[PDB]
Symmetry: C2
Subunit: 206 residues, 2 copies
């Protein structure tokens, strides 16, 4: 079992909890509860850049969310079939990451910037991100973003739709194919289960 | 096939790490510079930018945007992403560290001036206490000429590019890391990289 080292919170580890659950992959978590939990992982050499997230998997101690995710997507066959399909997947998910990063940092936003930032994010959701993904779905007519087969792109996007719903639930209203993807993916057995009470899935930061 | 075609401003910014990697791989590419708002508008309006932003690279029939998507495709295409899933994990970890420190340096200019003497000092602390020791430690652990798999990878390249910008910031920062110094000279003397560091290459200058 992969072992996820992090605080008991979403943060930078939640996207990995979603990917591993969507792939049927069981895992353990070990939560950092104090400064001395963290200082101990550092002192043991566990953290190449002194930071978590860190995941122990197949003999490695991987840090950096993108390295963790890339490894797991490839290992569990969620990274498409060849380098061209990786490339679409990578392009789609890096856009998802950029939008995610905005939302994820919004609560540490200086209070005097908050109004402006919220408007800018919703304007990007409506005019930049959601149109791009609706287009992809519409261009090929298929249930999945890439190669007609579940990949990390579907997972990461649907994860983000849930965060956008929490932020403002009207934002997705004009994008039926996104809504439809959300529904379809949220009904896969592994994701439906992760979405039910009792899973490793974490609440919003308060 | 088509030479890859890089669409960006005529500056370093977020395309420079792409220039380094292609030039290191011996790959001939063309550049199409964005000079005006109108130029960027036309790329957008043409539907060439999935997310309405550059960098964008035309390669193998795709219009790839997002720096990490571009880099990841080119590294695999030219055997600069390791030989298997485990070596790529190490490469990804190494290069995401590099990108974190690189982003901080990259943005430092557009810091508001009242915060800039404190950013700069924080950057220098992490270089000396976090990043350079992390990479010196990898190099010392294997004794080999390259970071991963005893073979040129994209990690050596992104790392040595960042060594050049760290030098621009403060040439003293590297002085206690003998293996990083050694890496930088060796990689800089690779034929393709020596050429790219010679005048008249696509390598771009600092911004003024």
């Amino acid at each position: 079992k992969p072992k996820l080292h992090y605080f008991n919170a979403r943060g930078r580890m939640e996207s990995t909890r979603w990917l591993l659950a969507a792939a049927g992959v069981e895992f353990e978590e070990k939560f950092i509860k104090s400064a001395e939990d963290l200082d101990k992982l550092r002192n043991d050499g566990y953290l190449m850049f002194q930071q978590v997230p860190m995941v122990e998997i197949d003999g490695m101690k991987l840090v950096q969310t993108r390295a963790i995710l890339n490894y797991a997507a490839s290992k569990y066959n969620l990274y498409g079939k060849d380098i061209k399909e990786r490339a679409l997947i990578d392009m789609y998910i890096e856009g998802i990451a950029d939008l995610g990063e905005m939302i994820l940092l919004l609560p540490v936003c200086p209070p005097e910037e908050k109004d402006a930032k919220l408007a800018l994010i919703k304007e990007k959701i409506k005019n930049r991100y959601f149109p791009a993904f609706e287009k992809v779905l519409k261009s090929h007519g298929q249930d999945y973003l890439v190669g007609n087969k579940l990949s990390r792109a579907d997972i990461h996007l649907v994860e983000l739709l849930y965060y956008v719903e929490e932020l403002d639930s009207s934002l997705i209203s004009s994008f039926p194919l996104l809504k439809a993807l959300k529904t379809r993916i949220s009904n896969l057995p592994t994701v439906k289960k992760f979405l039910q009470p009792g899973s490793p899935r974490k609440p919003p930061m308060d």
